[PDB]
């Protein structure tokens, strides 16, 4: 759904930089693809897609396929890479990244 809403080549540079098995962080990746360039509104729409279980929330499982909107199966978290996104974006440390938390980590990425 966000594959046509992106630049295409921007997703090939971020994923090509993290493809390693633990080379993903979340800042250099999103900063590359260009998700922060989107507008807070078009960001709430990017998150609505991150929301895998349609629960207006980004749970740890979402993090596993966080880059799914860009690729049904693009970057497959290594597990440790998923433990970074969760402890790098979850500021309140609640276990769920709502929008403001997500759009805040997508723009500061
Ligand atoms: Ca959710
Ligand atoms: Ca949170």
From Swiss-Prot:
InterPro entries from the UniProt entry: EF-hand-dom_pair, EF_Hand_1_Ca_BS, EF_hand_dom, Parvalbumin
Modified residues annotated as N-acetylalanine in this record: 2
Keywords, alphabetical: Acetylation, Calcium, Metal-binding, Muscle protein, Repeat
Residue ranges constituting the EF-hand domain according to the UniProt record: 38-73, 77-109
Binding site residues for Ca(2+) 1: 51, 53, 55, 57, 59, 62
Coiled-coil region: none
Tagged with keyword Metal-binding: yes
Binding site for Ca(2+) 2: 90, 92, 94, 96, 101
Record flagged with keyword Repeat: yes
Pfam families, sorted: EF-hand_7 (PF13499)
GO molecular function, one term: calcium ion binding
GO cellular component term of the entry, any: cytoplasm
Gene3D superfamilies assigned: EF-hand
Family the UniProt entry places it in: Belongs to the parvalbumin family.
PANTHER family to which the protein is assigned, alphabetical: PARVALBUMIN ALPHA, PARVALBUMIN-7
Remarks, miscellaneous: This is the major component, having an isoelectric point of 5.0.
Functional description taken from the UniProt entry: In muscle, parvalbumin is thought to be involved in relaxation after contraction. It binds two calcium ions.
The protein, known as: Parvalbumin alpha
Record organism: Esox lucius
């Amino acid at each position: 759904a966000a594959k046509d809403l992106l630049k295409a080549d921007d997703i090939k540079k971020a994923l090509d930089a993290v493809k390693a098995e633990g080379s993903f962080n979340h800042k250099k990746f999103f900063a590359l693809v260009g998700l922060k360039a989107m507008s807070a509104n078009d960001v709430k729409k990017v998150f609505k897609a991150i929301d895998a279980d349609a629960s207006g929330f980004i749970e740890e499982e979402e993090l596993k396929f966080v880059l799914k909107s860009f690729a049904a199966d693009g970057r497959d978290l290594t597990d440790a890479e998923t433990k970074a996104f969760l402890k790098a974006a979850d500021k309140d440390g609640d276990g769920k990244i709502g929008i403001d938390e997500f759009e805040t980590l997508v723009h500061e990425a």
